[PDB]
From Swiss-Prot, chain B:
Coiled coil (UniProt feature): none
Family: Belongs to the complex I NDUFB4 subunit family.
Cellular compartments annotated: Mitochondrion inner membrane
Protein name per UniProt: NADH dehydrogenase [ubiquinone] 1 beta subcomplex subunit 4
Bilayer-spanning residue ranges: 21-40
Cited function: Accessory subunit of the mitochondrial membrane respiratory chain NADH dehydrogenase (Complex I), that is believed not to be involved in catalysis. Complex I functions in the transfer of electrons from NADH to the respiratory chain. The immediate electron acceptor for the enzyme is believed to be ubiquinone.
Subunit structure: Complex I is composed of 45 different subunits.
Section covered of the full-length record: 66 to 129 of 129
Highest rank taxon of the organism: Eukaryota
From Swiss-Prot, chain D:
Species this chain originates from: Bos taurus (Bovine)
GO cellular component: mitochondrial inner membrane; mitochondrion; respiratory chain complex I
Transmembrane segments: 14-32
UniProt function note: Accessory subunit of the mitochondrial membrane respiratory chain NADH dehydrogenase (Complex I), that is believed not to be involved in catalysis. Complex I functions in the transfer of electrons from NADH to the respiratory chain. The immediate electron acceptor for the enzyme is believed to be ubiquinone.
Subcellular location: Mitochondrion inner membrane
Subunit structure: Complex I is composed of 45 different subunits.
Recorded topology in the membrane: Single-pass membrane protein
The name this protein goes by in its record: NADH dehydrogenase [ubiquinone] 1 subunit C1, mitochondrial
Shown chain mapped onto the complete sequence: 28 to 76 of 76
Family stated for the protein in its record: Belongs to the complex I NDUFC1 subunit family.
Record's keyword terms, sorted: Electron transport, Membrane, Mitochondrion, Mitochondrion inner membrane, Respiratory chain, Transit peptide, Transmembrane, Transmembrane helix, Transport
From Swiss-Prot, chain E:
Gene, per the UniProt record: MT-ND6
Keywords recorded for this protein, A-Z: Electron transport, Membrane, Mitochondrion, Mitochondrion inner membrane, NAD, Respiratory chain, Translocase, Transmembrane, Transmembrane helix, Transport, Ubiquinone
The name this protein goes by in its record: NADH-ubiquinone oxidoreductase chain 6
UniProt xrefs under Gene3D superfamilies: NADH-ubiquinone/plastoquinone oxidoreductase chain 6, subunit NuoJ (1.20.120.1200)
GO biological process: mitochondrial electron transport, NADH to ubiquinone; mitochondrial respiratory chain complex I assembly
Pfam families: Oxidored_q3
Provenance organism: Bos taurus (Bovine)
Residue ranges crossing the lipid bilayer per the database entry: 1-21, 25-45, 47-67, 88-108, 149-169
Function, as annotated: Core subunit of the mitochondrial membrane respiratory chain NADH dehydrogenase (Complex I) which catalyzes electron transfer from NADH through the respiratory chain, using ubiquinone as an electron acceptor. Essential for the catalytic activity and assembly of complex I.
Domain of life, source organism: Eukaryota
UniProtKB/Swiss-Prot annotation, chain F:
Annotated family: Belongs to the complex I 49 kDa subunit family.
Spans traversing the lipid bilayer: none
Modified sites of kind N6-acetyllysine: K29
Compartments where located: Mitochondrion inner membrane
Gene, per the UniProt record: NDUFS2
SUBUNIT field: Core subunit of respiratory chain NADH dehydrogenase (Complex I) which is composed of 45 different subunits. Component of the iron-sulfur (IP) fragment of the enzyme. Interacts with NDUFAF3. Interacts with NDUFAF7. Interacts with CERS2.
Coiled coil: none
Biological role: Core subunit of the mitochondrial membrane respiratory chain NADH dehydrogenase (Complex I) which catalyzes electron transfer from NADH through the respiratory chain, using ubiquinone as an electron acceptor. Essential for the catalytic activity and assembly of complex I. Redox-sensitive, critical component of the oxygen-sensing pathway in the pulmonary vasculature which plays a key role in acute pulmonary oxygen-sensing and hypoxic pulmonary vasoconstriction. Plays an important role in carotid body sensing of hypoxia.
Protein name listed in UniProt: NADH dehydrogenase [ubiquinone] iron-sulfur protein 2, mitochondrial
Amino acid sequence: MNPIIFIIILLTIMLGTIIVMISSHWLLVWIGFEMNMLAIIPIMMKNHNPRATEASTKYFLTQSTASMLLMMAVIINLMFSGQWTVMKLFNPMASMLMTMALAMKLGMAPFHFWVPEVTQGIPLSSGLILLTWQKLAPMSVLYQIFPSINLNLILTLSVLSILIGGWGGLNQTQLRKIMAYSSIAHMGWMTAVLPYNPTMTLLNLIIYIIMTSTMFTMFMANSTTTTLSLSHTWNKTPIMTVLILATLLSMGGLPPLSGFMPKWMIIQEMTKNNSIILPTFMAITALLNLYFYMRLTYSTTLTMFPSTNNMKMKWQFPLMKKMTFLPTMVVLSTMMLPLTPMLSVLE
Amino acid sequence: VRWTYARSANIYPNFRPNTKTSLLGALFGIGPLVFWYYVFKTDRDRKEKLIQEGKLDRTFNISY
Amino acid sequence: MSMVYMNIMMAFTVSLVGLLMYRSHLMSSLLCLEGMMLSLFVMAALTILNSHFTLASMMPIILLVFAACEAALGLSLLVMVSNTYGTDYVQNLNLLQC
Amino acid sequence: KFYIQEPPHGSPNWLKVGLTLGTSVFLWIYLIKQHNEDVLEYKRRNGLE
Amino acid sequence: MMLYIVFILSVIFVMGFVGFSSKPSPIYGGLGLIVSGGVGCGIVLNFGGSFLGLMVFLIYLGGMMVVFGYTTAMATEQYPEIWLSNKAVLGAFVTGLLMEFFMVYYVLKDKEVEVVFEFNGLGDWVIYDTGDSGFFSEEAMGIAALYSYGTWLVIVTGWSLLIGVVVIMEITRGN
Amino acid sequence: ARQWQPDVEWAEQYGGAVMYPTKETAHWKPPPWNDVDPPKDTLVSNLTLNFGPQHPAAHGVLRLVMELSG
Amino acid sequence: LQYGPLAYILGEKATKKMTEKSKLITVDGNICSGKSKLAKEIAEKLGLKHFPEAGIHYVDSTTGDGKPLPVQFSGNCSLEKFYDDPKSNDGNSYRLQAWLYASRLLQYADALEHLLSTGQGVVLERSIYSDFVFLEAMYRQGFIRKQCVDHYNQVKKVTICEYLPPHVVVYVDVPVPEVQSRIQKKGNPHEMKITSAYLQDIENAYKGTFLPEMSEKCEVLQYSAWEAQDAEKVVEDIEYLKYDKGPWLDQNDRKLHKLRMLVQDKLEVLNYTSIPVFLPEVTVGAHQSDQVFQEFTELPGRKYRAGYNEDVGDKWIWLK
Amino acid sequence: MMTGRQGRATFQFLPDEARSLPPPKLTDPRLAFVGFLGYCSGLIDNAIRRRPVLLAGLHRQLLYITSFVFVGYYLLKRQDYMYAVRDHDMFSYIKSHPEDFPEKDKKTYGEVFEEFHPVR
Amino acid sequence: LLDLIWLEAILPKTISLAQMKASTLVTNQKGLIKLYFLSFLITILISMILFNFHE
Ligand SMILES: CCCCCCCCCCCCCCCCCC(=O)OC[C@H](COP(=O)(O)OCCN)OC(=O)CCCCCCCCCCCCCCCCC
Ligand SMILES: Nc1nc2c(ncn2[C@@H]2O[C@H](COP(=O)(O)OP(=O)(O)OP(=O)(O)O)[C@@H](O)[C@H]2O)c(=O)[nH]1
Ligand SMILES: [Mg+2]
């Protein structure tokens, strides 16, 4: 792509999301999703290969179906309330349709199948946009309609997402597929707490984005997309293996790292509402994710896998990728737990 | 090396749950626990019953 | 509700089932997607016109414009798929299985 | 001269160095100024001496 | 029977949908959608949406569907399988018309049916407005207001269409 | 002795398509190193046209075997 | 300004720098074919930059102080040991070929970066495009296993697809008996052990595979040993080529910006030369590679990024 | 829960009523920790780019510390404002609904009966 | 009998074995658009008929 056109397309992806986030009108929310989908397809197609074309097609079909269901919910809401204001919906059928539409857009289980495939089929930079920025608009909508959401439906989607994400990631060797299932699992935490305290949905979203952004950036720095290609990092950039280790432990939710904070604060809110079984089940099931994060740390940082002779040639050249914000992101991904009370700025 | 390996690491791979292993494990594993539970639970219930009725001698029993 | 809504809502349901139950041609599924938009356009227009919601009269046009633009994007992807494989069959789009 | 090819970071980028140090000074001066006025306004509103 | 023109049209509307939703060869799928679109415009006209109805013909049928048929010819179909000559296509078509027939049967007989929502079968005319004597078309006034009230809508809609041109050129270049 | 570190046999456990092979994933293979699959399906874009004159009133006896590209 | 998208937007576009003289020329031929002598002659007459053939230590010559590094930092690849013992069970034969392919791949990216950044043409002696003739010759003599050939083809497949071929391929044709005579004259004890079977397989690969393939996309010029002596005629022929085939005609500023972004980043160039395919010839255990890597960083000017090494006289490090 | 506060000046980082609160002290231990995180980010930046970790680019390290401390100061001001608002809302509600928060008539342990469970 | 066998079988070994089996069920998919969207239809139908999420 012409670099100027690439900038305009990224700004349009952001504009679509911003429109969703500032709109008080359901039509403008729908337009924001349409604009966002239109602008993201080129960045998925940009490397021109059959896998990128398949991923773009699978993504287009999923998102277009979701957006039609969203519009159906809006129109039903208009028929039963005569207004367009972005707020609680006034019909239970409209609520179910919009909740399902947003679950499809988020890739929540059982609407999840596209996330692993689409992420695998596109470049790492595109996957970073797909798994971080693309969650902002659907979450911002769920944040505003949650009082009218069916409690059983949203909690069912959350439980399934945590289960499927945890189990799906166990069988993966591709880094992009691991991040896709990790995203699905982390999605379930955000929606599980939404009925009780939407502020903790925002907290988990922000910290998830920071950690996911850190992981993709480090994968991009060495152009690694598989477990075995990442296992060579120790013999090229040792510092990167330590940073990868810290972030993976943080994503695993281990104290005293930053990733424990969202799990800690969500458990607190659910227990205040006499929800004991569900947070206990969620916390235990999250051990699945810790397992396949720990497997990566074993092959990357805590042991030394075999290298190749041609790796010696790489020693003579410096890293020249930008790695934008990486030093800041990795610190925020790991060392923020002592500042947990700062979550009140999200209130 | 073969001897120490056979006495540890090689055991579980060659284990099969069947009638012999299941029964012995239940008999040696759970058996003693159930037995000792009923010995102490019985003894303590009897002793507790006597203390509530003042029928157990604890005249100089002040260390516990 | 009035009787007409029953049929418009059936049409959306029918085209949604048609969208979710693929055969082979990717083109046949895109038509079901456009069918969904047509039924939304009609139901929106009927609700807005009957209620005399004057400023909402422009909403069906915006719906049609944005949905046609999204249909152009869908057709472009179909052409790129047909270039890769020579057909628009969805069973050739299974590389990402692994 | 040791390097066969001149490194991109052979010598300081004196423009960046100047803009880096100036930015730090600006933020520090601005932060101190902000803090002093917040303390003054906090005292005025609470009628404190 | 002319007093149920809207309902009769909506029955044809559903039948056309069952047409292309059973997904025969794309060539005939486009035909079902074209007929449904034309019937759809007819329903909108009978509610006082003359401009909206004609937009369907001009933009949906004369624009979008022409391009679909154009693309189908080049990239998809050149000759079709006979309509309803396939087991699944015919079974889906029969199933749809049976469901439509029964919905129509009960709504007309009991004057009311109930599936997700409650529907009344008195006739769509009963809900119409009984006061009309302005010297203009309310629909046209609302659409004309796009340029006065809807500045923000024009900007984002205009931006999306421009980005559509850019994006589609990117997608189809192939390198 | 020296600390054990993974050998090729250990490392190859993580190089398959999946972590836990099954009968239903036996045919699965790792994707291309650079994500590019070879274009082997259909690429036949050159028309061959036996060309004559629109009206045979003047030429009549011209046969032109042309190969076109768009 | 370091080249990048912003420099491109500010007018740094390859079509400005390049002219009809901005050509990439490779000279090929068998061992002792005189290709090197001609290549220097072509480069001088046409005013092109000459690149001596990439050997084992080509990468050393572009980094650090430019001097060759000890052999253990090339994996102990030895051309001499390939001639003394081509079937050694230590894997030297394929380990050498894999290292040389990466060296040529690096040199080719260096040639493109020079051509695209400055607009001046370049002359290479062999390239990544003809490197495979040596692989076929090794394989047919039984010096390497068929698994080694598969590894080479896997690496070549995902690396060569990213580059443009040369504008001109100059082949110097010398029969094997004459090549064998010329090797004896040159008086290299290890090179004298080359067999005619090995030299013949190189020739067969050049003529059966290389030249037919490059003819479809490059301007191929062939010369006998005697004709190649007249560089004036060779240069004359190059100047009157039409240049009407090949992917270079389908290039614009946008596509050359993407190419330049690649060839400038040498780690992105070499990314796939170290794919995790565990072939014994090229696989190094962690203990060895850990040991050698630590010794590499202990070399002068190697501990830190270039320009941050006090031990070689870098200054102002606290402000860089 | 506090999204629709009656006195919520919407989409304002620090509404004007926040100016009645004492500012965070520049010696606040949380602000010192934020500065430390900035210093760690500076060291990591050197490490990933293979510069001498402690000495390289002291100007860059200083801007890491300043920017973290600068942003940290305002985030703490908002943090303290949001907890002040929470307490203000809580106490106002308790006053407005005395029937829901009655002062208990609370007895001494001499009067309240607690069962004894012997440990024997 | 106890330490190396049954105390492994009743907890870590069996729990680990079940997760592995569940993982292969989740990830043994054919990558077919047709089947994935067919499962969406089942999800929507179940959500209404069985769980009445639309109410
Ligand atoms: C004026 C120029 C413009 C730039 C000015 C900016 C300066 C501030 C930026 C931060 C830099 C701090 C100073 C760093 C000094 C590093 C000097 C150095 O690298 O020399 C190494 C020195 C001695 O080591 P040596 O004996 O030579 O060799 C030992 C072999 N193992 O080893 C040392 O003694 C180094 C000691 C460690 C460095 C100090 C650690 C500072 C910690 C900061 C905590 C941040 C807290 C922020 C809180 C703020 C809240 C308001
Ligand atoms: N195994 C192997 N040896 C190579 C390769 N490239 C060069 N060599 C060896 O490097 C030595 C010198 O290469 P040549 O250029 O062909 O020999 P030369 O004497 O310089 O011949 P001219 O330059 O044409 O005059 C020869 O002994 C080659 O066998 C290679 O890709 N693989
Ligand atoms: Mg030579």
